[PDB]
Amino acid sequence: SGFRKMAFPSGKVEGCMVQVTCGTTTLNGLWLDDVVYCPRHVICTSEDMLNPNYEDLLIRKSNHNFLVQAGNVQLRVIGHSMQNCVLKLKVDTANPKTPKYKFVRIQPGQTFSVLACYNGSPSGVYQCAMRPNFTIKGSFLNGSCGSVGFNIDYDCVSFCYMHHMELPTGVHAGTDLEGNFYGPFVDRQTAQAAGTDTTITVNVLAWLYAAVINGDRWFLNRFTTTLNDFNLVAMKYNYEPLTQDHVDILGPLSAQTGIAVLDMCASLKELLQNGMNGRTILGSALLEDEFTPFDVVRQCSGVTFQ
Amino acid sequence: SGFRKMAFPSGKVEGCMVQVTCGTTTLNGLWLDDVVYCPRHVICTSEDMLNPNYEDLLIRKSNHNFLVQAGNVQLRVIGHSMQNCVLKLKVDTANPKTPKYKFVRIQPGQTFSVLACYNGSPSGVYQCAMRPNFTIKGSFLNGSCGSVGFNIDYDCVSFCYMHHMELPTGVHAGTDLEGNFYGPFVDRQTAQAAGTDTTITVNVLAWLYAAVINGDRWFLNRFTTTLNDFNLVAMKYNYEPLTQDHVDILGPLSAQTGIAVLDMCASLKELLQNGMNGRTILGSALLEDEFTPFDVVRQCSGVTFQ
């Protein structure tokens, strides 16, 4: 028993992190087979960042202008290209610690683990949600660029996020591993607006089931609502609307607890409208929205990797 | 920027996790050089656990009654001994993935990372504090016994915790790697009292510094106080006493932020007496006491390991 924000074990990712250097810019790369992936802004000086023409900047760079370092050793680049906002450096060596992997583009509300790195070395691992406005609320210092987010499926690492930018507002933006930004952001040092953020309703509901499973049940009540009823309240609290898809994904949790999805919704409706008084839930004074329904089942059923 | 509850990268510990089975009980073991370390209650049935005589139970066991599995590899057990509440199994093979390591006994209020494991396989990683009352508020299901807590120092793993039990209260208890319980606890399925559990004041102050560093400043007031005045308030709020040693450890954060420790103390006193008025600090509606001053400096400085 007990419920915590758990990250996936990071060992399989730690073996893929390298240091990439171009001029005097250094950040993190991801070495998979004979390719190193990193933020294309590795090619920019701080001044270039204000208004980069990446095609022009990259032309001034040859294979040999890229210094990729794997712990001790130093790899040889024999090919480079730019795919959207990522640079792909073909190297002369396949990574022998290359895990089974795929590249995935996640959806808002979905969670992942971030392995925060500096200079190609792992610092820390934490669990993040992609916000509805396609930012993440991470913890990233200068140098952390090219740090990656991932999920694990027994033995297969699904890479979903590469860190590219801190917005002037101090939240984080990045790309999938094909170099396509999540959200409206660009890799230029300019004021950029993230949308209005909203709370991930289906995640809060998941987390309330986790609370019941762990013996926190005070917020329960035998009130009802329709989906449409609930949403007309949720939207007044900047909650994402709940769809039937969301009801269907909560089905198993409903089944395990004997609390119908629409009842848990009635319970949340109450919590928003009436607040929490002084009481906590799973040790939290706010409603948590960074556990997906699948996160809760995994942690509550003890799913393992390898 | 940003601030998250971050664990150490787990890869070095992942390589040490094994499954240990004795009759119908399976749990996790830690394989370092040619020794596997696990909870001695691996020799117990659910029945035995009500009142075990570990000396008499272990008498009935030979080396071959212990099945140790590392991945798909069955290790051969060539010796067994009990040290306090851990069993040590001598095996014929040194773990080729043994990191540099120490065994350390941590103090209450210190933090570490737990690699939660089931059947010898890693499930997830999270950061924990040893509560003043020597419990941990973890996430441990049936079969997580033998999971370990650790800190990393560049390339050296400091193992500080092995999980043994859940108290009927739903909190967690275990040992150091020499098999000595933290707290008054025994490895028996019986009613067991934990102390009253107090807030780790020095960690709260650390976290207030982190908040200031991240621009969260609303709670800074225009009062000072004395250590004694502060402590008088602390005891009433179930907060641990603050000592000069604690003031000394906060010194660098004081230096970085320009806020004198005792000024931060007076701010904290005010939050305790007045509460937070529905406001948040670093995304929390409660005062967080799981970051040590070292954790805050480490995270705010981007300290890496291998």
Side-chain angles (χ1 to χ4, degrees):
Chain A
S1 89
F3 199 75
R4 285 250 178 194
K5 189 69 84 19
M6 292 204 321
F8 292 97
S10 59
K12 303 181 172 234
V13 179
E14 291 162 43
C16 301
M17 302 308 306
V18 292
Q19 186 201 243
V20 183
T21 293
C22 191
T24 70
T25 304
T26 290
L27 43 61
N28 305 291
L30 183 78
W31 184 21
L32 301 174
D33 308 309
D34 67 345
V35 174
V36 171
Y37 304 82
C38 65
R40 65 174 175 176
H41 72 76
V42 70
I43 70 190
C44 296
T45 68
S46 77
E47 176 181 2
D48 292 322
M49 275 310 298
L50 274 31
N51 185 200
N53 186 312
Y54 285 98
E55 312 62 58
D56 286 356
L57 288 175
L58 182 61
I59 284 156
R60 309 193 192 98
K61 294 297 193 273
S62 301
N63 283 341
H64 64 75
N65 298 114
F66 287 112
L67 174 64
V68 172
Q69 308 176 229
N72 186 3
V73 79
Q74 302 217 3
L75 282 56
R76 166 200 302 282
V77 188
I78 69 204
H80 73 252
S81 55
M82 170 159 67
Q83 177 179 16
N84 305 302
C85 301
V86 299
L87 207 63
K88 288 148 65 201
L89 309 175
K90 173 151 196 131
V91 285
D92 68 356
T93 309
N95 185 353
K97 308 218 281 263
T98 298
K100 251 165 280 189
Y101 76 87
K102 66 177 70 150
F103 290 168
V104 168
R105 196 181 170 85
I106 61 163
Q107 301 288 315
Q110 289 193 283
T111 57
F112 56 92
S113 295
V114 167
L115 179 65
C117 299
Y118 301 85
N119 296 303
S121 292
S123 181
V125 63
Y126 60 86
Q127 185 78 351
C128 265
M130 179 66 62
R131 300 305 315 159
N133 67 358
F134 289 107
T135 63
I136 72 176
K137 285 204 195 109
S139 171
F140 287 111
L141 300 182
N142 320 316
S144 72
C145 287
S147 281
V148 297
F150 63 97
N151 285 284
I152 305 182
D153 186 323
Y154 266 81
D155 64 349
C156 179
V157 183
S158 276
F159 294 100
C160 57
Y161 180 80
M162 182 173 259
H163 180 62
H164 278 247
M165 282 185 86
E166 183 161 305
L167 299 187
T169 64
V171 298
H172 302 108
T175 69
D176 60 29
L177 270 295
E178 298 188 299
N180 298 302
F181 262 89
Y182 290 100
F185 310 113
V186 295
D187 48 351
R188 164 180 192 206
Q189 182 192 320
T190 197
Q192 289 187 66
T196 309
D197 201 21
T198 54
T199 305
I200 313 150
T201 309
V202 67
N203 291 2
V204 172
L205 289 168
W207 176 80
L208 296 173
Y209 281 105
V212 169
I213 287 170
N214 283 93
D216 253 308
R217 296 187 185 63
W218 57 255
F219 43 84
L220 301 175
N221 50 62
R222 293 182 183 174
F223 291 121
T224 64
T225 75
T226 76
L227 202 48
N228 187 253
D229 286 344
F230 170 83
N231 290 333
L232 296 197
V233 177
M235 268 315 325
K236 301 180 177 184
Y237 290 83
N238 274 218
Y239 269 57
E240 225 67 16
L242 200 70
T243 61
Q244 185 59 40
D245 281 353
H246 293 142
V247 171
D248 294 347
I249 74 182
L250 285 163
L253 287 178
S254 178
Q256 160 176 358
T257 50
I259 302 162
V261 179
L262 277 182
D263 280 303
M264 193 58 99
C265 289
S267 224
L268 180 55
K269 179 189 278 183
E270 178 211 289
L271 272 168
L272 293 178
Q273 275 170 354
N274 306 333
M276 257 178 91
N277 206 318
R279 201 134 8 104
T280 63
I281 295 176
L282 278 172
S284 173
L286 309 164
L287 304 177
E288 250 307 309
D289 76 349
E290 293 197 315
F291 299 96
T292 67
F294 292 165
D295 295 339
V296 172
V297 292
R298 254 205 289 101
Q299 172 162 172
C300 290
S301 83
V303 165
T304 63
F305 301 98
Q306 286 271 104
Chain B
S1 79
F3 203 74
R4 288 264 202 184
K5 196 112 74 187
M6 192 157 327
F8 290 98
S10 59
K12 284 162 131 51
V13 184
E14 291 167 46
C16 305
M17 293 319 295
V18 304
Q19 177 186 246
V20 180
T21 303
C22 192
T24 65
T25 310
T26 292
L27 45 66
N28 304 288
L30 177 72
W31 181 26
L32 301 168
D33 310 319
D34 64 349
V35 179
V36 174
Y37 300 88
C38 72
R40 66 169 171 178
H41 74 246
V42 67
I43 68 188
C44 290
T45 56
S46 52
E47 172 149 350
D48 306 305
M49 276 314 279
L50 196 156
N51 190 21
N53 180 340
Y54 283 101
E55 281 201 351
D56 284 340
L57 286 164
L58 189 62
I59 290 328
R60 307 200 199 107
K61 302 304 176 187
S62 318
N63 292 334
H64 73 79
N65 298 147
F66 293 101
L67 292 37
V68 174
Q69 202 178 340
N72 284 139
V73 188
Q74 210 86 12
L75 301 174
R76 296 167 143 284
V77 178
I78 66 174
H80 62 273
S81 65
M82 183 165 297
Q83 178 181 15
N84 304 307
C85 295
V86 303
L87 177 79
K88 278 146 59 204
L89 307 178
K90 192 55 133 48
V91 298
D92 65 346
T93 306
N95 177 0
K97 292 179 188 179
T98 304
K100 298 162 198 177
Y101 74 92
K102 287 131 44 73
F103 290 169
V104 309
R105 183 154 182 116
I106 55 165
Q107 301 230 16
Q110 290 190 297
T111 51
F112 52 99
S113 287
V114 167
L115 181 66
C117 293
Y118 297 85
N119 310 296
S121 294
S123 185
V125 66
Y126 59 86
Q127 186 78 353
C128 261
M130 181 58 66
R131 298 317 300 166
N133 74 355
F134 293 100
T135 66
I136 73 173
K137 283 200 176 72
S139 172
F140 290 113
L141 305 166
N142 304 346
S144 60
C145 293
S147 301
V148 298
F150 62 96
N151 281 289
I152 299 179
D153 178 7
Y154 270 37
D155 62 352
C156 187
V157 183
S158 284
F159 295 99
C160 58
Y161 181 78
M162 173 171 281
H163 183 60
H164 284 245
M165 43 185 39
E166 196 182 86
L167 308 181
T169 59
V171 308
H172 300 116
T175 69
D176 59 28
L177 266 296
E178 285 192 39
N180 296 307
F181 263 93
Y182 293 98
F185 304 114
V186 297
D187 40 356
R188 178 186 177 188
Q189 172 95 287
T190 193
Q192 291 186 65
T196 45
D197 192 33
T198 48
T199 304
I200 317 162
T201 313
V202 70
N203 291 3
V204 175
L205 285 173
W207 176 77
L208 291 178
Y209 278 111
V212 171
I213 287 177
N214 279 267
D216 220 339
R217 294 183 294 74
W218 67 260
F219 57 83
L220 296 182
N221 70 16
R222 288 197 323 318
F223 315 120
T224 199
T225 181
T226 73
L227 196 49
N228 284 354
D229 313 353
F230 180 73
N231 286 322
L232 243 192
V233 179
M235 309 323 160
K236 306 198 87 182
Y237 279 95
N238 292 306
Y239 273 55
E240 285 296 312
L242 201 73
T243 70
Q244 191 53 46
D245 281 350
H246 294 148
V247 164
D248 285 347
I249 297 147
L250 292 169
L253 292 170
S254 206
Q256 180 181 353
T257 66
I259 298 160
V261 177
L262 279 177
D263 294 351
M264 194 61 90
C265 287
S267 259
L268 173 51
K269 146 155 54 178
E270 192 183 53
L271 288 163
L272 286 181
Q273 294 172 335
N274 307 352
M276 278 178 68
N277 290 121
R279 280 177 302 241
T280 60
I281 298 175
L282 284 181
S284 179
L286 306 172
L287 301 192
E288 260 299 320
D289 79 338
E290 293 177 350
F291 300 92
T292 69
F294 179 65
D295 298 338
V296 172
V297 166
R298 167 160 68 73
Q299 168 162 183
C300 292
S301 139
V303 169
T304 61
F305 321 98
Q306 286 212 358

